[PDB]
Amino acid sequence: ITLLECVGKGRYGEVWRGSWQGENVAVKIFSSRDEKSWFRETELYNTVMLRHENILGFIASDMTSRHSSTQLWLITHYHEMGSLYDYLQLTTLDTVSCLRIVLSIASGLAHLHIEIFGGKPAIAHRDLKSKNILVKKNGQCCIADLGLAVMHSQSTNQLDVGNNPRVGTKRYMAPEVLDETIQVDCFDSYKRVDIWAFGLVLWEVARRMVSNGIVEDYKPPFYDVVPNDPSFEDMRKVVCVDQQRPNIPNRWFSDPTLTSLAKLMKECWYQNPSARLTALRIKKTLTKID
Amino acid sequence: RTVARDITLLECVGKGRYGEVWRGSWQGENVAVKIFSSRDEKSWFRETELYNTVMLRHENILGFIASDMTSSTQLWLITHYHEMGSLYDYLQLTTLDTVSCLRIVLSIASGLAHLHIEIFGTQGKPAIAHRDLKSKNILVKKNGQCCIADLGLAVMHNNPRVGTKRYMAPEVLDETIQVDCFDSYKRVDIWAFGLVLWEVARRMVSNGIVEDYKPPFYDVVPNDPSFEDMRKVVCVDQQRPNIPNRWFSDPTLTSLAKLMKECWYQNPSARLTALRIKKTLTKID
Ligand SMILES: COc1cc(-c2cncc(-c3ccc(C4CCN(C)CC4)cc3)c2C)cc(OC)c1OC
Ligand SMILES: COc1cc(-c2cncc(-c3ccc(C4CCN(C)CC4)cc3)c2C)cc(OC)c1OC
Ligand SMILES: COc1cc(-c2cncc(-c3ccc(C4CCN(C)CC4)cc3)c2C)cc(OC)c1OC
Helix, strand or coil, rough: EEEEEEECCCCCCCEEEEEEEEEEEEEEEEHHHHHHHHHHHHHHHCCHHCCCCCEECCEEEEEEEEECEEEEEEEECCCCCCCCHHHHHHHCCHHHHHHHHHHHHHHHHHHHHEEECCEEEEEECCCCHHHHEEECCCEEECCCCCCCEEECCCCCCCEECCCCCCCCCCCHHHHHHHHHCCCCHHHHHHHHHHHHHHHHHHHHHHHHEECCCCCCCCCCCCCCCCCCCCHHHHHHHHHHCCCCCCCCHHHHHHHHCHHHHEEEEEEEEEEEEECCCCCCHHHHHHHHCC | CCCCCCCCEEEEEEEECCCEEEEEEEEEEEEEEEEEEEHHHHHHHHHHHHHHCCCCCCEEECCCEEEEEEECCCCEEEEEECCEHHHHHHCCCCCHHHHHHHHHHHHHHHHHHHHCCEECCCCCCCCCEEECCCHHHECCCCCCCCCCCCCCCEEECCCCCCCCCCCCCCHHHHHCCCCCHHHHHHCCCCCCCHHHHHHHHHHCEEEEEECCCCCCCCCCCCCCHHHHHHHHHHHHHCCCCCCCCHHHHHHHHHHHHHHHCCCCCCCCCHCHHHHHHHHHHHHCC
């Protein structure tokens, strides 16, 4: 592997565009601060039946050490168009491209959430957001970063919540995460947190779909109501105390597709987690829209 | 930067149900490569999770180089390579003198005490119990010291895998072990250590005499002894390995026999600690 170009740097570590046997690959180099995400992602990618067109493709994971220095690498497919967050900054969507994106995300999420016997455990992501979705050259997306994932099997009644003090991205946390009332030993609780975050992603995408010559600028969820670099408490205030949800631009109600998407995202945002749609129902609804 | 991950596999040095171990070459140096069967993936996951928690570095612990998952899934553990092989291998083709026998057993005690001890701080470690100590899980280094290998069953203060039945302590065989008490697992390691000390002491020459290499309980259980075979010997009959008369003519072997007795008490809380074993060994000879 030759590391060519740094494509991301934060507290998790860095991601590099790398060359391997002539092909681009993505190399995530973890900080020791996030070593538990490296191990969790490795446990999740050990599932051969995780493999799916809308899940970021695994190549290898390695821990290498000499003396007191440890290197933690995750190597995946490389998507040169980058994340959905990057794509939406500068590009607008037509109806077909908007539905293709959101159906591909629903398809990946339903794949994660549903157990296959024989297989793959049921999986909840816990950090779904537009920076954790990659855009592929076919116009479908794939879901990335399983470092916070929770696994469940109904066949053995086993829940595996892993060992990771990391929490989800604050801007996308559901009300029950922000108020810390979430039932921690309930697998359905985790799926419902993913559905809340999916609704926010739907909103980010729909804003960029043109209708009647109008589009909204890219904004992240709750851009207008919290400080820059919002705290956990900043998010709790708007989501839990103020009962805020992302505003639906009135121009959407002129367009059948955006009217349907607004209905879908509202059914992701109930404060009652058990009222929210399932990923399978979202996928079926998006298979029927326009 | 170009990261070279070119490992060449040269010769297979071990093959079991676990998988295989190869002598390999990495940047001109010998490394050992363990290739796991999918049947024993939990052992790779446990050892990897442990090393991702605490990067153990100790002269008497097999040196960690890398843990690799490649996409079925292939799971590889890469360590230092010890050309003299396992203590089990080594004791079949050599006898020992007083100095080499003590250096072997004190190095094992040193590795085990390092596993067992909690050290506070950024630079520290959780306490660890091995749970499968035996002569095949100890390697002989060129300098005459040993190192402990295989943390697949280790616990920090796997899965279908259980300890090697020949070396199981009485409380494991009678299922009385207090499973939520970390000290219980240390005491299981001390039992197994005592058996290893017996295996090594047999091969130490005194007055021109040596015993043949044998595994513990060779005279009272079959090959691949069952759980019931072991329970009847160790729990019901309370048998222990034989101390030959000739040891009692040798001050070193007399001291070693006393030490192994203090590793084999039926009551696990009566057994010596690894630290107390080290101290005793430093005062022999
Ligand atoms: C695991 O295995 C082996 C690896 C290597 C090896 C090869 N390339 C680069 C490195 C390296 C360089 C520099 C740092 C540090 C420098 C100080 N600070 C800034 C943090 C980072 C870390 C690591 C290494 C250690 C050599 C070995 O020996 C020949 C190994 O053993 C077989
Ligand atoms: C989310 O998580 C993971 C993602 C990836 C990954 C895979 N393909 C492509 C990328 C990418 C490439 C390029 C850009 C551009 C965007 C715009 N521009 C201003 C600079 C950079 C962004 C992103 C990434 C980040 C790999 C990972 O692991 C190896 C991930 O972690 C699991
Ligand atoms: C117990 O466990 C592990 C052990 C090892 C390991 C490390 N050095 C050397 C060896 C070895 C080499 C050579 C022989 C024999 C064969 C050839 N003939 C010339 C006689 C000598 C035996 C043994 C091993 C098996 C590595 C492991 O992992 C990578 C182990 O698992 C954690």
